[PDB]
Design a protein around this ligand. Structure first.
Ligand code: MG
Ligand code: MG
Ligand code: MG
Ligand code: MG
Ligand code: MG
Ligand code: MG
Ligand code: MG
Ligand code: MG
Ligand code: MG
Ligand code: MG
Ligand code: MG
Ligand code: MG
Ligand code: MG
Ligand code: MG
Ligand code: MG
Ligand code: MG
Ligand code: MG
Ligand code: MG
Ligand code: MG
Ligand code: MG
Ligand code: MG
Ligand code: MG
Ligand code: MG
Ligand code: MG
Ligand code: MG
Ligand code: MG
Ligand code: MG
Ligand code: MG
Ligand code: MG
Ligand code: MG
Ligand code: MG
Ligand code: MG
Ligand code: MG
Ligand code: MG
Ligand code: MG
Ligand code: MG
Ligand code: MG
Ligand code: MG
Ligand code: MG
Ligand code: MG
Ligand code: MG
Ligand code: MG
Ligand code: MG
Ligand code: MG
Ligand code: MG
Ligand code: MG
Ligand code: MG
Ligand code: MG
Ligand code: MG
Ligand code: MG
Ligand code: MG
Ligand code: ZN
Lengths: 187, 103, 53, 159, 148
RNA sequence: CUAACACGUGCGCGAGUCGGGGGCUACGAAAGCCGCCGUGGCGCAAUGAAGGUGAAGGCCGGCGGCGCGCCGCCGGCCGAG
RNA sequence: GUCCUGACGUGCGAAUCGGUCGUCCGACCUGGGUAUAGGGGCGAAAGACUAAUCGAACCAUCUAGUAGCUGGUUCCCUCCAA
RNA sequence: UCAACCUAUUCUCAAACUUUAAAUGGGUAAGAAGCCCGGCUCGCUGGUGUGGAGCCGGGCGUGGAAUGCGAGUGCCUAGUGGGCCACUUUUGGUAAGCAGAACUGGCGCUGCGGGAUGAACCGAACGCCGGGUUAAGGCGCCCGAUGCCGACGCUCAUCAGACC
RNA sequence: GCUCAGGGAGGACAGAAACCUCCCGUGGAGCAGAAGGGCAAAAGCUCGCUUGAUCUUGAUUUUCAGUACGAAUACAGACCGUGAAAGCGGGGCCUCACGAUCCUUCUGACCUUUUGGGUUUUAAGCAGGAGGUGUCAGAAAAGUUACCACAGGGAUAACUGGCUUGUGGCGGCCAAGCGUUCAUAGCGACGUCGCUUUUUGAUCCUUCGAUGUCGGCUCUUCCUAUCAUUGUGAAGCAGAAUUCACCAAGCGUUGGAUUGUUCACCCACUAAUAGGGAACGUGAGCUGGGUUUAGACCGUCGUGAGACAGGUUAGUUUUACCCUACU
RNA sequence: GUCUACGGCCAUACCACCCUGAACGCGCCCGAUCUCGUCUGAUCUCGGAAGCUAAGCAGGGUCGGGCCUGGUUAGUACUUGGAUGGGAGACCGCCUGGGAAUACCGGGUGCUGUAGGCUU
């Protein structure tokens, strides 16, 4: 026979989006062609991010966009998020941005267009720059979700800063034996 | 064991080494109006008989002897429990022993 | 018998609750009952305010 | 079941060699350890303060901390299925430098000196260590005599 | 397979039964072969043996696929950077073990030979004790001829 | 099958979100609408047992203060690793 | 109701039949009326009897009692697999 | 004289003795996170801009053993927690198809050729087929194959012998 | 600051052993304990001074899930001890000497809450010890059932059968000796190698949705390790008798008294009264004397229900018409 | 060549006995008022210089014991891996590799750092 071990024989990654959306599948039908038929890997990574799940393409906010676009060198470039460009209310002035996203929330659309910016979709991005040149590809904070505070080294183990699953935060709800130094032990 | 009744040790209030009258800690009288005591008593009152478990299998002969360390210096007079490794027979300050003698 | 990681919880189902479960299937019948009663009251006190005093 | 003492089964491990009892020699104290010096462990029974556990006798680690009498080193212990790179604190005399790093440092400064030399000259030196190759072809001079004949000597039950 | 021997066979790229691989000899490699040595028969091949193996069964690992070496461009696109172009200087490098023998031999797929015509004399013993495993020195050139 | 929780996944909106309880207008006990019905839940802030407290700093000028080059405070500037 | 430990032992019978047996004027046998009710009755005492049920009747309900213990657990193909 | 003694000698041992002391094996290393310079900071250490550590700034690529190969990481998670056999090491036991361990491979979860028969042995691991060739084991007949003009000996059994 | 166990040589009573001195003395002593390591101007012995066996936050090791408690290791912040000083010391030279929540007690601060406000007792807190779970990661706990039950287990006993053969039985080998003489007619010590599964053990693989668990009676067949009979070889075989051996299981191997008996012993005949196997042959063949239900009495034990490889008495033995086998 | 003071590795330095030590040293030595400490100026401390290599110590010697380090023992014993090898077993042989220790016989007997003398 052959003594190859078939555990990791199959790659796990996606080849099609799980969504049954039709506009997203048209964007996939376009970027399949562009990444197959160009030699710029912006197209490969942007179809790889069109495929993803909405917990893997987190919402990038407009404060991150303003900061990471005002970092020096990248003036009049095109910000590209594959997720959802959301408003961030704790920022006052907004510079002229040139952004491209699947879906921009309504107050962020109003904010950028009052600042004098321009919103694009991905079909217009492919017309405007097919190899994706002149673009800054950004992604949202992926471990910004509240779930990742429950992950890692478990609570009740030394040097583990993990939020434990408790039904209501209070005085009585798991503050006593693993936590105190008088009540039992402190981990 | 033999412990002298005066230890020159740390004093947490004065922040420095001071002499200490050393005696032995003994448990105070149990108050009828502590919270757990009157909780237990009210839960016992009625029917059901014994409610909280009665410990029967006492298994060790010793208890850890605890020294009460009063500061000598007259306005401070702080106290600490300083308990040492357990021992069956225990005395305070009697017969500082001497080597090289007949029996 | 709790598994790896997850909120330990106290569901209050230790009583016999299936003999007493109030089910809301007469919600829209009760709303049309109330508003037909409200229309009858509002037209039987005819110029007075329907909301009462 | 066995006992789980800290020094179980270390009769011949922490004991000194034969006729090397007595006072510890003082070079082992006078050696100095930076952080990142690769360090062997060899526990010793003449001192008991700061004893490395018998899991670590012979293991080699890296210093991450040096204190007044002891260093802290980072050694790899394998427990059931994983390897833990863990911190221990060992007094200064259970410890030697490893010469395994020193031979590499010698070879690095030799490679760098004969790289910075014979770059101005133009020739190409070899820097990798190829392993011991097969023996190249060579004549054997049987100058004069015939080779000596051998034969198996017959069995004599000498017992 | 004892797991040490399984690992050394996985580094020698003998996975299936009756595969074959060229191996250059040095002190590391002879000890690697001798850990395995109840499971292999390894010898000193002739130039005709290297020719029979390359032309008859020699396939190339291109884009980690097994494309049969039909014409010289399949060799030249993958080893032109080491300045061997055709099958002839492929065979020359492998026979006169060259500088880029590592990448030439890693280019060639592990050879897949048929079962020996005529038959093995005994599998589970060494060649010295009248068997087949071990170190036939030159007598691999009587076993390649009937295994391909 | 109902409830609770966890994680993954698709969908809408996105620092907000949700009318489920109430109200207004055959299939329809559906559907729509409310917005001064967001009361409220969850989230946007944690920590402490509790009283409670509650998430950048620097540079410039003026007044060892002496055996607060630090500066206590004022006016300007850069300004969020 | 002794013994045959006979018959029968899917019987005539969920305890019957045959021969042999005990007692047969007294603590005798028996009909009907009445009393005692389940953790109770009643017992010349065997834990017997209490409607073919007795070291705690029967009927309904709680009730689908619980069980780390047995039994079972319904279509195909492909992949990974202790 | 016979003794202890004492001094050189001699015979036999040791799981819980040892001067010596293998094989197998256990860590570490085989560079770019490394070297070599120039310089700032420190409340630590300080005869000593000492020692150490941290920060800047620059220059070095022959990628510094062989061999093989794309890797790293994060959730959620069923089932399992009665095991057994074998080469070797080995404990109790007289011994066991007995009980108890170590390494590795199997069986269990696994077919298929061989060992007549067989969970574990020898070979060998499987999609459905055609051709060729083998492995272990065979070739009087059952039964494919010695129906070779096979080679060299030993062996008579009134209980022959015949394959892990 | 000193050197220890032991030994040698001296010395009034003095000795085998009191004490003084000299010399050898690598640990043969001591260090609390069990052992292992460790140790000689010390870790031992004797002094002097003492309380680092104290207050405090972190990290790490150890068993480990890489979690607790215990125990330990480097540090760090004071407050000290000692030494002239370097330093050493936060318990015992190292390896064991020990304990969660809840509850109670004590200690600590010009502490927090005590509920509309204030004061004051009380109570609740916060941290640090202690009271303890020895089944030691931590319930509060006496029996009996033969009147017994239920869920299961052949994971686990009592049968047979299996692997093994200690023990039982049986047979060799070597030859010190018995056999007046003589190792070997007939035996055989000290040793030693086996065979059998008719004893007992050992094991627990099969059976717990049941394989009917003692004997006897009846009945067939088988083995040979042969008691007799047929034929032979050997004798310390004169005869008669008897011992040992070979081929050999064809044909026999009984009647009874006692006992439930298997066994055992005895009476009598005998040619001989040999041994055994077939699920310790044989209960849908019988018997039920025994053990092995429920009723009872006795002894001992137990306060008692009741228990007794202790005795004794009474105590249901079911079904063939199927297939196979045989007649 | 050599010594003292401080040493490093700790016997190629130890131990027993014998011989030789010029100069500087190191010593032995002479004392006890003061410092100090004892039964005792033996020790420790303190003040010295009349004498002596006698001892220490230094160098050297012994068909010396020891130690160190080679040969032999020996490719022996043992041993990773392998066979449908042998043997009733015990154990043994073989292939692929690795490879010890006594007895016995030779060689060696301190090297050396920092500071300061001596050999006018
Ligand atoms: Mg295949
Ligand atoms: Mg598979
Ligand atoms: Mg997989
Ligand atoms: Mg009352
Ligand atoms: Mg589960
Ligand atoms: Mg053929
Ligand atoms: Mg989700
Ligand atoms: Mg009757
Ligand atoms: Mg009857
Ligand atoms: Mg009948
Ligand atoms: Mg009739
Ligand atoms: Mg009568
Ligand atoms: Mg009554
Ligand atoms: Mg009556
Ligand atoms: Mg009864
Ligand atoms: Mg009852
Ligand atoms: Mg059910
Ligand atoms: Mg259970
Ligand atoms: Mg499941
Ligand atoms: Mg094999
Ligand atoms: Mg076993
Ligand atoms: Mg498997
Ligand atoms: Mg298989
Ligand atoms: Mg067979
Ligand atoms: Mg075929
Ligand atoms: Mg055949
Ligand atoms: Mg001392
Ligand atoms: Mg300190
Ligand atoms: Mg109040
Ligand atoms: Mg009874
Ligand atoms: Mg039996
Ligand atoms: Mg026997
Ligand atoms: Mg005689
Ligand atoms: Mg069983
Ligand atoms: Mg059955
Ligand atoms: Mg039957
Ligand atoms: Mg016979
Ligand atoms: Mg009779
Ligand atoms: Mg029977
Ligand atoms: Mg019967
Ligand atoms: Mg029968
Ligand atoms: Mg009976
Ligand atoms: Mg009875
Ligand atoms: Mg009594
Ligand atoms: Mg009929
Ligand atoms: Mg004097
Ligand atoms: Mg002298
Ligand atoms: Mg002299
Ligand atoms: Mg000598
Ligand atoms: Mg010198
Ligand atoms: Mg002169
Ligand atoms: Zn005080």
């Amino acid at each position: 026979g052959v003594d190859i071990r078939h555990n990791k024989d199959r790659k796990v990654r996606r080849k099609e989006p799980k969504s049954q959306d039709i506009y997203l599948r048209l964007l996939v039908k376009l970027y399949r062609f562009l990444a197959r038929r160009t030699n710029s890997t912006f197209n490969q990574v942007v179809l790889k991010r069109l495929f993803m799940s909405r917990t893997n393409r987190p919402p990038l906010s407009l404060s991150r966009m303003i900061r990471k676009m005002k970092l020096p060198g990248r003036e009049n470039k095109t910000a590209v998020v594959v997720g959802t460009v959301t408003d961030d209310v704790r920022v006052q002035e907004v510079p002229k941005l040139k952004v491209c996203a699947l879906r921009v929330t309504s107050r962020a659309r109003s904010r950028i267009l009052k600042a004098g910016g321009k919103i694009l979709t991905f079909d217009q991005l492919a017309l405007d720059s097919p190899k994706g040149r002149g673009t800054v590809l950004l992604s949202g904070p992926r471990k910004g979700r509240e779930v990742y505070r429950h992950f890692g080294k478990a609570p009740g183990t030394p040097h583990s800063h993990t939020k434990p699953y408790v039904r209501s935060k209070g005085r009585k709800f798991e503050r006593a034996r693993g936590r105190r130094a008088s009540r039992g032990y402190k981990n | 064991v033999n412990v002298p009744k005066t230890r020159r040790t740390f004093c947490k209030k004065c922040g420095k080494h001071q002499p200490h009258k050393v005696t032995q800690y003994k448990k105070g009288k149990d108050s009828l109006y502590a919270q757990g005591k009157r909780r237990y008593d009210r839960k016992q009152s009625g029917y059901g008989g014994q409610t909280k478990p009665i410990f029967r299998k006492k298994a060790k002969t010793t208890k850890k002897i605890v020294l009460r360390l009063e500061c000598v210096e007259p306005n401070c007079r702080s106290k600490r429990m300083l308990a040492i490794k357990r021992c069956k027979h225990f005395e305070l300050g009697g017969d500082k022993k001497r080597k090289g003698q007949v029996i | 018998a709790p598994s790896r990681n997850g909120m330990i919880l106290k569901p209050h189902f230790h009583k016999d609750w299936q003999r007493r479960v109030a089910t809301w299937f007469n919600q829209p019948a009760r709303k049309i009952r109330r508003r037909k009663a409200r229309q009858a009251r509002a037209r039987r006190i005819a110029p007075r305010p329907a909301a009462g005093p | 079941t066995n006992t789980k003492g800290k020094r179980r089964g270390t009769r011949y491990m922490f004991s000194r060699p034969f006729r090397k009892h007595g006072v510890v020699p003082l070079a082992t104290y006078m050696r100095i350890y930076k952080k990142g010096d690769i360090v062997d462990i060899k526990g010793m029974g003449t001192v008991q303060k700061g004893m490395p556990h018998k899991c670590y006798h012979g293991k080699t680690g890296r210093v991450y901390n040096v204190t007044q009498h002891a260093v802290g080193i980072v050694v790899n212990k394998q427990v059931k299925g994983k390897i833990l790179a863990k911190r221990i604190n060992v007094r200064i005399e259970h410890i030697k430098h490893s010469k395994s790093r020193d031979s590499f440092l010698k070879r690095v400064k030799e490679n760098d000196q004969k790289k910075k030399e014979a770059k101005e000259k133009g020739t190409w030196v070899q820097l990798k260590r190829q392993p011991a190759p097969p023996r190249e072809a060579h004549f054997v001079r049987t100058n004069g005599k015939e080779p000596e004949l051998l034969e198996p000597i017959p069995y004599e039950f000498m017992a | 397979v004892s797991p040490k021997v399984r690992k050394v066979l996985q580094l020698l790229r003998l996975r299936q039964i009756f595969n074959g691989t060229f191996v250059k000899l040095n002190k590391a490699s002879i000890n690697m072969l001798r850990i395995v040595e109840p499971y292999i028969a390894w010898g000193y091949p002739n130039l005709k043996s290297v020719n029979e193996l390359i032309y008859k069964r020699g396939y190339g690992k291109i884009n980690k696929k097994r494309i049969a070496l039909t014409d010289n461009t399949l060799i030249a696109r993958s080893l032109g950077k080491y300045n061997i172009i055709c099958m002839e200087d492929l065979i020359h490098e492998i026979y006169t073990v060259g500088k880029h023998f590592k990448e030439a031999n890693n280019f060639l797929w592990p050879f897949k030979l048929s079962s020996p015509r005529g038959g093995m004399k005994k599998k589970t013993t060494h060649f010295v004790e009248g068997g087949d495993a071990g170190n036939r020195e030159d007598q691999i050139n009587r076993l390649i001829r009937r295994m391909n």
